[PDB]
Scaffold this active site. Structure first.
Site, PDB file in Angstrom:
ATOM      1  N   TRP A  71       0.746   6.835   3.841  1.00  0.00           N
ATOM      2  CA  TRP A  71      -0.370   6.908   2.875  1.00  0.00           C
ATOM      3  C   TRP A  71      -1.249   8.120   3.151  1.00  0.00           C
ATOM      4  O   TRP A  71      -1.699   8.824   2.224  1.00  0.00           O
ATOM      5  CB  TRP A  71      -1.210   5.604   2.841  1.00  0.00           C
ATOM      6  CG  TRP A  71      -2.136   5.382   3.982  1.00  0.00           C
ATOM      7  CD1 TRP A  71      -1.936   4.597   5.060  1.00  0.00           C
ATOM      8  CD2 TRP A  71      -3.462   5.948   4.145  1.00  0.00           C
ATOM      9  NE1 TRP A  71      -3.021   4.653   5.912  1.00  0.00           N
ATOM     10  CE2 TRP A  71      -3.987   5.440   5.343  1.00  0.00           C
ATOM     11  CE3 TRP A  71      -4.271   6.757   3.353  1.00  0.00           C
ATOM     12  CZ2 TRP A  71      -5.303   5.754   5.767  1.00  0.00           C
ATOM     13  CZ3 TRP A  71      -5.514   7.136   3.798  1.00  0.00           C
ATOM     14  CH2 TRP A  71      -6.054   6.604   4.983  1.00  0.00           C
TER      15      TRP A  71
ATOM     16  N   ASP B 257      -9.917  12.070  10.695  1.00  0.00           N
ATOM     17  CA  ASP B 257      -8.841  11.294   9.975  1.00  0.00           C
ATOM     18  C   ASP B 257      -8.401  11.997   8.704  1.00  0.00           C
ATOM     19  O   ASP B 257      -9.173  12.132   7.719  1.00  0.00           O
ATOM     20  CB  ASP B 257      -9.467   9.916   9.667  1.00  0.00           C
ATOM     21  CG  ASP B 257      -8.479   8.890   9.176  1.00  0.00           C
ATOM     22  OD1 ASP B 257      -7.642   9.249   8.292  1.00  0.00           O
ATOM     23  OD2 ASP B 257      -8.717   7.691   9.537  1.00  0.00           O
TER      24      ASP B 257
ATOM     25  N   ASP C 204      -5.339  -4.462  -4.111  1.00  0.00           N
ATOM     26  CA  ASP C 204      -5.585  -3.018  -4.195  1.00  0.00           C
ATOM     27  C   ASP C 204      -4.267  -2.254  -4.347  1.00  0.00           C
ATOM     28  O   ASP C 204      -4.288  -1.138  -4.890  1.00  0.00           O
ATOM     29  CB  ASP C 204      -6.389  -2.389  -3.017  1.00  0.00           C
ATOM     30  CG  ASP C 204      -5.696  -2.484  -1.649  1.00  0.00           C
ATOM     31  OD1 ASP C 204      -4.778  -3.331  -1.432  1.00  0.00           O
ATOM     32  OD2 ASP C 204      -6.134  -1.715  -0.754  1.00  0.00           O
TER      33      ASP C 204
ATOM     34  N   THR D 184       2.309 -13.204  -0.550  1.00  0.00           N
ATOM     35  CA  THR D 184       0.933 -12.809  -0.759  1.00  0.00           C
ATOM     36  C   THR D 184       0.878 -11.348  -1.135  1.00  0.00           C
ATOM     37  O   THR D 184       1.405 -10.498  -0.409  1.00  0.00           O
ATOM     38  CB  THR D 184       0.124 -13.068   0.541  1.00  0.00           C
ATOM     39  OG1 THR D 184       0.236 -14.441   0.896  1.00  0.00           O
ATOM     40  CG2 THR D 184      -1.341 -12.728   0.303  1.00  0.00           C
ATOM     41  N   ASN D 185       0.221 -11.011  -2.260  1.00  0.00           N
ATOM     42  CA  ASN D 185      -0.011  -9.627  -2.605  1.00  0.00           C
ATOM     43  C   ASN D 185      -1.284  -9.128  -1.929  1.00  0.00           C
ATOM     44  O   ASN D 185      -2.061  -9.921  -1.404  1.00  0.00           O
ATOM     45  CB  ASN D 185      -0.048  -9.398  -4.137  1.00  0.00           C
ATOM     46  CG  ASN D 185      -1.421  -9.489  -4.759  1.00  0.00           C
ATOM     47  OD1 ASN D 185      -2.197 -10.381  -4.399  1.00  0.00           O
ATOM     48  ND2 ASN D 185      -1.739  -8.551  -5.694  1.00  0.00           N
TER      49      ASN D 185
ATOM     50  N   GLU E 227       0.798  -1.174   0.000  1.00  0.00           N
ATOM     51  CA  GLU E 227       0.000   0.000   0.000  1.00  0.00           C
ATOM     52  C   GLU E 227       0.859   1.263   0.000  1.00  0.00           C
ATOM     53  O   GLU E 227       0.688   2.188  -0.828  1.00  0.00           O
ATOM     54  CB  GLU E 227      -0.928  -0.056   1.219  1.00  0.00           C
ATOM     55  CG  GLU E 227      -1.614   1.240   1.622  1.00  0.00           C
ATOM     56  CD  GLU E 227      -2.409   0.937   2.901  1.00  0.00           C
ATOM     57  OE1 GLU E 227      -3.568   0.389   2.828  1.00  0.00           O
ATOM     58  OE2 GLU E 227      -1.793   1.161   3.997  1.00  0.00           O
TER      59      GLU E 227
END
Ligand code: G2I
Ligand code: G2I
Ligand code: 9MR
Ligand code: CA
Ligand code: CA
Ligand code: NA
Length: 700
Positions: free
Chosen positions: A681, A531, A224, A220-221, A48
């Protein structure tokens, strides 16, 4: 100037003095270390985060005309988190058998019921893309990001297949829908059995077989993340980037990302509706959505010449990325892969994803969870009357129930941002008429009108103790259209919704022309918060939505006007929350009693060594709950990870727990722990919101 705002945050993020990046140039989940939410430590990083880094460098490169930072970020990604090495990071992938991709095992409703038997009870179906990928690239080595990296080697496993890299491949989640982030056990992706249980490594926590498990690797990907990387490169190329060297890598990633479109064990889509699945033939096991992951793995060492692949059966709306799908499927998108069917699979996916969004949209406009091809994760018969989408069973909380995976309001903002981009893209490319644009438009238009009822700038909504919004008469607002939330004046504040509580089901899908409006599908929006990541995502959804409306009609529509002003105002108020390092606000974490709670399961008879050198489970345990169907013990998150007690923030957390948390009631009596986090992010979502407002609105 929104351009200058973007540039200032860009420099704050990139500055060596701020600590967003490790000394090897890899972005962390967050500057702070003590945090737990999906990664379980702040100096993990994720696929991500890498995907957001690309997005950041794309918009910087457009403004500066210097694409070299994008290329360096891609290089960094390839060096450290995509396990292909130009020493083999996927040994024996060449021995993969596409006519028997993996060996079946059942998922379980609690972590206590693992390890699961590798029974092979369901023979796996045909993998119909392996052959194409091999012919196209001369390899079947997976060009996707592994999702999790221990950047500072905090778990101390090291990096077996690339020992000079400090950042090590690790995994956590393995044990089903009730294994929250708090309940998993960090383990190396490349397991030579030097840690874990002697002769077994960590494998025997998760799967059981007649033999001792072999030394083995697996990755594991997160679908998204790789798609968001493709979305970033889509925009690079729209904005003038044209180095084929890297454009071709994004196409390659897209080709391999096709593994996310397949049922876990390549069972035919729909075939387990009555509990009796059968293996797929051709593309029969292709659901044409992005499921939660694809995994791959194989033997370590000379005696272990085997490898395997699984897709996933469970699909969450919040993971779909139709911008990536358009980029990989049209001449206009510009990233069509060279494989025989990669582009035409992505074209089918683009449509299926838009149908999925329309299907899932609640009576009031919010997007419900998703769907599965493997009910209970063992191909159980769907419940009587369960609604379906291409013969997959509706799920309100795909994959995780702790917490329910579609409650977080960020799962609205992230996909609806992409759908708004996509509306904008179709109209820019001269499409106002296709079924696809009509779907995208309908869904985002209904969503924007839904979302605006819970967005507050310069006012503070009224909510009750349980987090329900209140109207002017003090009554709870339990969903519905036209929500009228009571408000008090609060100059300089912003508030967004925090969660949704879901009830009911969409009607069964029969296509866009028979959609019903889903009158028994209800979203109750709750828990007002501040947030900043979600804010930056929302801003972009509103920005691209507004821009689309004006390209379509010549002027901002009524709703486009409202979305544009909301974006502008949110950007204006958020700027005051810049601390010089990021746009941040303080958050309470009532979940942080789970650092201390005894709920990390180990099976009876299982002892080993954790990465940090402690015996696990060790002696600080309680018996597991026999209602959860295991036979074992629980330790705590903090006992499992003793080095967390060296964190600078640990003694404040422990002291706050001692003085405020009541173990008998399970409640924080004198307030919960409070933190001001600088998440990578989240900062990128903010910086890109300034940039895109400037580009789409201020300039056009
Ligand atoms: O911070 C990034 C995570 C949260 N947001 C979306 C994604 O980018 C990423 O999600 C995580 O992606 C991981 C990789 O797909 C997920 O973990 C996987 O969960 C799968 C089963 O639930 C496991 O079979 C698999 O071994 C495990 O690696 C985990 O649940 C899921 O939360
Ligand atoms: O503790 C609940 C909330 C307290 N009020 C402020 C909120 O901001 C906070 O919500 C939490 O906000 C976090 C930051 O946005 C959320 O973390 C995110 O959760 C996402 C979905 O799993 C991940 O993809 C991402 O990596 C991760 O940072 C987390 O789920 C979400 O529960
Ligand atoms: O259920 C399929 C895989 C999911 N989780 C972990 C993996 O080891 C499982 O794969 C099996 O590993 C076996 C040996 O350990 C191997 O011989 C099988 O071919 C794999 O599917
Ligand atoms: Ca690599
Ligand atoms: Ca749980
Ligand atoms: Na190395």
């Amino acid at each position: 100037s929104n351009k200058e705002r973007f540039l200032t945050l860009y420099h704050q993020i990139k500055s060596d003095a701020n600590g967003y990046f490790s000394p090897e140039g890899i972005p962390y989940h967050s500057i702070e270390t003590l945090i737990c939410e999906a990664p379980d430590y702040g100096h993990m990083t994720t696929s991500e985060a890498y995907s957001y880094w690309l997005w950041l460098e794309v918009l910087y490169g457009h403004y500066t005309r210097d694409w070299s930072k994008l290329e360096a970020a891609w290089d960094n990604m390839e060096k450290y988190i995509i396990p292909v090495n130009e020493n083999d990071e996927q040994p024996h992938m060449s021995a993969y058998n596409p006519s028997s991709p993996a060996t079946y095992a059942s998922e379980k409703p609690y972590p206590d019921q693992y390890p699961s038997q590798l029974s092979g009870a369901r023979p796996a179906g045909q993998d119909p893309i392996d052959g194409e990928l091999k012919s196209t690239y001369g390899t079947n080595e997976t060009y996707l990001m592994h999702w999790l990296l221990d950047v500072d080697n905090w778990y101390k496993y090291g990096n077996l297949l690339n020992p000079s890299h400090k950042a090590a491949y690790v995994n956590t989640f393995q044990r089903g829908q009730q294994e929250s982030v708090w309940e998993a056990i960090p383990h190396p992706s490349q397991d030579d059995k030097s840690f874990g249980k002697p002769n077994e490594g960590f494998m025997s926590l998760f799967t059981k077989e007649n033999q001792v498990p072999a030394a083995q690797w697996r990755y594991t990907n997160a679908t998204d993340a790789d798609a968001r990387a493709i979305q970033a490169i889509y925009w690079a190329k729209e904005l003038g980037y044209n180095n084929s060297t890297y454009l071709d890598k994004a196409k390659k990633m897209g080709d391999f990302l096709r593994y996310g479109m397949y049922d876990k064990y390549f069972q035919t889509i729909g075939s387990g509706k009555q509990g009796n699945p059968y293996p797929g033939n051709g593309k029969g096991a292709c659901h044409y959505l992005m499921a939660w992951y694809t995994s791959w793995g194989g033997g370590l060492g000379d005696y272990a010449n085997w490898s395997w692949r699984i897709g996933a059966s469970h699909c969450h709306q919040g993971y779909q990325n139709p911008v990536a799908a358009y980029a990989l499927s049209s001449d206009k998108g510009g990233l069509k892969p060279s494989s025989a069917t990669g582009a035409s699979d992505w074209e089918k996916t683009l449509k299926r994803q838009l149908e999925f969004y329309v299907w899932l949209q609640s009576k009031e406009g919010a997007i419900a969870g998703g769907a599965t091809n493997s009910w209970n994760g063992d191909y159980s018969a769907y419940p009587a009357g369960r609604s379906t989408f291409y013969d997959m069973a509706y799920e309100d909380a795909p994959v995780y129930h702790d917490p329910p995976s579609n409650n977080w309001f960020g799962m609205q903002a992230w996909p609806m941002e992409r759908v708004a981009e996509l509306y904008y893209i179709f109209v820019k490319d001269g499409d106002k008429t296709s079924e696809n644009v009509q779907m995208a438009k309908s869904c985002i238009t209904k969503w924007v009108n839904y979302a605006l009822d819970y967005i507050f700038i310069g006012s503070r909504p009224v909510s009750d103790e349980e987090g329900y919004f209140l109207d002017d008469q003090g009554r709870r607002i339990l969903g519905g259209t036209n929500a009228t939330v009571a408000t008090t004046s609060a100059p300089g504040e912003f508030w967004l919704p925090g969660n949704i509580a879901w009830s009911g089901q969409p009607d069964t899908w029969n296509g866009f022309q028979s959609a019903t409006g889903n009158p028994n599908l209800t979203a109750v929006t709750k828990d007002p918060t501040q947030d900043t990541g979600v804010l930056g995502s929302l801003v972009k959804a509103f920005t691209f939505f507004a821009a689309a409306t004006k390209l379509e009609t010549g002027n901002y529509t009524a709703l486009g006007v409202r979305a544009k002003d909301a974006a502008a105002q949110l950007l204006e108020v958020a700027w005051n929350y810049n601390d010089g390092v990021g746009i941040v606000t303080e958050e309470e974490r009532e979940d942080y009693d789970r650092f201390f709670k005894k709920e990390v399961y180990f099976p009876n008879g299982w002892n080993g060594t954790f990465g940090q050198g402690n015996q696990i489970p060790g002696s600080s345990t309680i018996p597991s709950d026999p209602q959860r169907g295991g036979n074992g013990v629980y330790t705590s998150f903090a006992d499992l990870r003793p080095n967390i007690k060296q964190d600078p923030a640990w003694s404040s957390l422990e002291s706050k727990y001692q003085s405020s948390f009541n173990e008998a009631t399970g409640k924080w009596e004198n307030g919960a722990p409070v933190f001001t986090y600088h998440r990578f992010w989240s900062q990128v979502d903010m910086a890109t919101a300034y940039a895109e407002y400037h580009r789409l609105i201020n300039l056009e």
